[PDB]
Design an enzyme around this catalytic site. Structure first.
Site, PDB file in Angstrom:
ATOM      1  N   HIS A 169      10.080  -4.330  -4.586  1.00 40.63           N
ATOM      2  CA  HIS A 169      10.305  -3.478  -5.743  1.00 40.63           C
ATOM      3  C   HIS A 169      10.473  -2.050  -5.248  1.00 40.63           C
ATOM      4  O   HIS A 169      10.088  -1.715  -4.125  1.00 40.63           O
ATOM      5  CB  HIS A 169       9.158  -3.576  -6.759  1.00 40.63           C
ATOM      6  CG  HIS A 169       7.828  -3.157  -6.215  1.00 40.63           C
ATOM      7  ND1 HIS A 169       7.049  -3.983  -5.434  1.00 40.63           N
ATOM      8  CD2 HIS A 169       7.137  -1.999  -6.340  1.00 40.63           C
ATOM      9  CE1 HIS A 169       5.938  -3.353  -5.101  1.00 40.63           C
ATOM     10  NE2 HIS A 169       5.967  -2.146  -5.637  1.00 40.63           N
ATOM     11  N   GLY A 207       0.818  -1.197   0.000  1.00 43.19           N
ATOM     12  CA  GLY A 207       0.000   0.000   0.000  1.00 43.19           C
ATOM     13  C   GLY A 207       0.851   1.246   0.000  1.00 43.19           C
ATOM     14  O   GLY A 207       1.993   1.236  -0.464  1.00 43.19           O
ATOM     15  N   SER A 264       6.494  -4.751  -1.432  1.00 42.07           N
ATOM     16  CA  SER A 264       7.605  -3.912  -0.993  1.00 42.07           C
ATOM     17  C   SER A 264       7.391  -3.399   0.424  1.00 42.07           C
ATOM     18  O   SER A 264       8.208  -3.648   1.318  1.00 42.07           O
ATOM     19  CB  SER A 264       7.776  -2.733  -1.952  1.00 42.07           C
ATOM     20  OG  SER A 264       8.305  -3.143  -3.196  1.00 42.07           O
ATOM     21  N   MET A 265       6.297  -2.671   0.651  1.00 41.75           N
ATOM     22  CA  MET A 265       6.042  -2.169   1.995  1.00 41.75           C
ATOM     23  C   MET A 265       5.745  -3.317   2.949  1.00 41.75           C
ATOM     24  O   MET A 265       6.158  -3.287   4.113  1.00 41.75           O
ATOM     25  CB  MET A 265       4.892  -1.163   1.977  1.00 41.75           C
ATOM     26  CG  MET A 265       4.459  -0.664   3.355  1.00 41.75           C
ATOM     27  SD  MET A 265       5.820  -0.242   4.468  1.00 41.75           S
ATOM     28  CE  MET A 265       6.687   0.999   3.510  1.00 41.75           C
ATOM     29  N   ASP A 307      11.278  -5.264 -10.837  1.00 43.34           N
ATOM     30  CA  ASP A 307      10.394  -6.107 -10.039  1.00 43.34           C
ATOM     31  C   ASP A 307      11.055  -7.453  -9.770  1.00 43.34           C
ATOM     32  O   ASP A 307      11.509  -8.129 -10.699  1.00 43.34           O
ATOM     33  CB  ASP A 307       9.058  -6.302 -10.759  1.00 43.34           C
ATOM     34  CG  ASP A 307       7.891  -6.486  -9.802  1.00 43.34           C
ATOM     35  OD1 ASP A 307       6.732  -6.387 -10.257  1.00 43.34           O
ATOM     36  OD2 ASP A 307       8.124  -6.741  -8.600  1.00 43.34           O
TER      37      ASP A 307
END
Ligand code: ADP
Lengths: 190, 191, 190
Positions: C121, C67, C96-97, C170
């Site tokens: 990413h 997000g 990622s997060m 990615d």
């Protein structure tokens, strides 16, 4: 001293007959205890012993020679229950003034709220204190007295209801033992 | 859904939501875009805490991405009116309105996390209609821009000209840079 | 509808939600796209657990697809600031997060499932408008990438050159491969 000490340590009987019993009882001791040609005079010490038996006390409180115990009460408690000296010294200061003539005219000898954690001898300091002063110990579990109708058990049920014949756990205990320590644990739950 | 947390009490256990339990500890949460409805809830909590203890300081977490300036004044005015000092902690990010409330805290109690961001820019309010009506509304927005710059100068300590230059265009201030600019005293790492 | 588990306590029976009962055991769940309200909810739970027991390690599951990056930092900074070691059990997809939080866990306490899939990413953001305005936002997003790359290397321990190299494009990493990269300590034995 007979009328003064009897009033404090003997509340069941009224003052006139009460004073006569203690005074007359002192003379009886002077008839049997002396072996021969002893002192006829009845000193204050001889009255404190007879009045103590009437009250079923160990003669330490009524006697005026128990100052040694009160003077070292703080040090004695530290050996029995060590730690939190500030808590032990506070009790001795209140007890000393009560027995030194500076006690309240109508309030109890002392009211304290031992606010502290568990396992720090909050109740141990009370049971050991009673042994030092030689007075009965009274313990009441406030957890039982949680409902609104439980208060009646402490003071008894009014006339016309079950439990009226019973005087009350709290009232009969203090009346039976006027000189005693009262412990109420878990008061917050009450 | 909001989780429930139980706090032990002498009489019996009490069930309270996670936001209400923290509110009991003087911890307010300002999350999401500012609005007249959410702002009303924030000021309500501040007034309630003032009555409980007017000495203890309030803690207002700020993780809002910006919102209407009208509702923001209600929170800003309430913070200054109440005697307790409000501690503003920037969580995640602080937009123009969020940054304004962030610096509006009492001096020495404003902090920002080491990874939080602080953005500040002029208001984006726009109006449309007849040329006559636009002139009236256009003059009003400039007053709000000048008023916000003056209030920011008092708290941040910078001159009105400096705030105007920085607020002329969008600018992102990192957590350490915020201390240099004067928005907060230092990072929240030790207490 | 969330279930309503029952808890056996000496005081009495209490009704809690499945998520709320798990919060008592220091078990926190994370799922769905990261949001400001969602992040503040996880933060609130962490603060409550710290006050209850600052020594008992906390458990935080992660099954989110990623997000907003800004709101995610509030959870990361909170996890570092609080004294309890918050373990990270990645039970599903970790973007990622989502992966950043997994790395943020205490060293020697992070975990992942054998079939869990984690992909990292570079932060993806867009902006449009005037030429001057895009430049400011463009510079800011690059700064965020540097901060995320710098902190990722610190927790994982991998060289910054390797972190910034693969993060450009990615990348999808499995659970066993994660141990080689240092992202996670080890999978659950049982
Ligand atoms: N400071 C202490 N010194 C001596 N014994 C202690 C102390 N604290 C706790 N204890 C012991 O703990 C037990 C319970 O003591 P009690 O006074 O009933 O505890 P509490 O105040 O927590 O109800 C006893 O064995 C008592 O001797």
């Amino acid at each position: 001293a007979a009328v003064e000490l009897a009033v404090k340590y003997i509340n069941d009987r009224h003052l006139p007959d009460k004073a006569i019993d203690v005074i007359d009882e002192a003379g009886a001791r002077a008839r049997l205890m002396p072996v021969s040609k002893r002192k006829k005079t009845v000193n204050v010490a001889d009255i404190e012993s007879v009045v103590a038996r009437i009250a079923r006390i160990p003669e330490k409180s009524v006697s005026q020679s128990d100052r040694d115990t009160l003077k070292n009460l703080g040090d004695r408690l530290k050996m029995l229950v060590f730690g939190q000296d500030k808590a032990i010294e506070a009790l001795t200061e209140a007890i000393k003034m009560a027995r030194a003539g500076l006690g309240h005219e109508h309030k109890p000898v002392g009211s304290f709220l031992f606010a502290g954690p568990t396992g720090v001898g909050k109740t141990e300091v009370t049971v050991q204190l009673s042994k030092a002063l030689g007075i009965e110990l009274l313990r009441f579990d406030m957890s039982e007295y949680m409902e609104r109708h439980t208060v009646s058990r402490l003071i008894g049920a009014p006339p016309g209801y079950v439990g009226f014949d019973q005087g009350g756990l709290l009232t009969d205990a203090v009346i039976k033992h006027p000189h005693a320590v009262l412990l109420l644990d878990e008061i917050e739950k009450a | 859904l909001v989780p429930m947390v139980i706090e032990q009490t002498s009489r019996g256990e009490r069930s309270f939501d996670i936001y209400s339990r923290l509110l009991k500890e003087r911890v307010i949460f300002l999350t999401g875009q500012v609005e007249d409805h959410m702002a009303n809830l924030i000021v309500a909590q501040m007034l309630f805490l003032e009555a409980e203890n007017p000495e203890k300081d309030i803690y207002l977490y700020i993780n809002s991405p910006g919102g209407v300036i009208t509702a923001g004044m209600s929170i800003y005015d309430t913070m200054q009116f109440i005697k307790p000092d409000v501690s503003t902690i920037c969580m995640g990010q602080a937009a123009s309105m969020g940054a304004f409330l962030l610096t509006a805290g009492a001096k020495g109690k404003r902090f920002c996390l080491p990874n939080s961001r602080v953005m500040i820019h002029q208001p984006l309010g726009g109006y449309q209609g007849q040329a006559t009506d636009i002139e009236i509304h256009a003059r009003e927005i400039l007053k709000v821009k000048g008023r916000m710059n003056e209030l920011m100068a008092l708290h941040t300590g910078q001159s009105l000209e400096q705030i105007e230059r920085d607020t002329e265009r969008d600018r992102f201030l990192s957590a350490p840079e915020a201390v240099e600019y004067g928005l907060v005293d230092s990072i929240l790492t030790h207490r």
